[PDB]
Amino acid sequence: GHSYEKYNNWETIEAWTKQVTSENPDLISRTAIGTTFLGNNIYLLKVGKPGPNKPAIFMDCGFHAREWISHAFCQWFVREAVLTYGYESHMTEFLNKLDFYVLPVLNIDGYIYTWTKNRMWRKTRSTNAGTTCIGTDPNRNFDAGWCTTGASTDPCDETYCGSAAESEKETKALADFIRNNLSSIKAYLTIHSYSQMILYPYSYDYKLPENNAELNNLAKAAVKELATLYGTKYTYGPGATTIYPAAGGSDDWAYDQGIKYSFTFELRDKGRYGFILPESQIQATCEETMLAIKYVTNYVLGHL
Ligand SMILES: [Zn+2]
């Protein structure tokens, strides 16, 4: 009983990954890149018309269990690609010329827990030595200024950095996939909520990427494009001064591997509903975010 305009549980999204692949075999393939702490397959969709030597854009959602609009977004992106391929010139050119690796839910165990026990859960569901407190913050678990600022060393805290960089099965699987595909992957996009921001490196220190002007200009134009649809206002800039310093983030790590276009999206809203954004806003949030994602995709494609 899947719908793009409601929040779907993991059983439903998993079945949707299978069915959307089966329904669109010329555009979609599915693999598992690893398993979670609890042993769930971490699915990944490769969305694109087959072709030789294609560059790729990588996008994940659901790092943080309670940010349900993020998981809804990766499904909407796939929805748009299959619906509009052949009809909308830009999306058709994108899928012909590049592949999108779309990882609909990274932290599946945390996501299941938000549906079964605790809506506001954030972290993974792995155990920690020496305590009964559960979970690591996956966006503090990457090898990027690991565990130095804006991350906690206490396993009982919501930004706990873990026992070591890539200690979590899930972040190890994502980092391994990106390392193994680094020559093809030209951009990295990671979808969170909330607060209406487009962020780029760096978050782990107050320092700026070599191509800061190019990123700043791109984030500025992407926010402008997003606002065209409903007037929704986003801010943008380097993470440490745009939202807060935070070490161990996947976007900073990906950028440090050489992926020059690396962005975090924090979708709606600005706190009225916060993480419990109602289903009635799924459509408007996804459609306007599609504009920014297609803007960024067009830029990447035009500047290879
Ligand atoms: Zn459906």
Ligand SMILES: [Zn+2]
């Ligand atoms: Zn169907």
Ligand SMILES: [Zn+2]
């Ligand atoms: Zn299953």
Ligand SMILES: [Zn+2]
């Ligand atoms: Zn063109």
Ligand SMILES: [Zn+2]
């Ligand atoms: Zn988040």
Ligand SMILES: [Zn+2]
């Ligand atoms: Zn957030």
Ligand SMILES: [Zn+2]
């Ligand atoms: Zn649409």
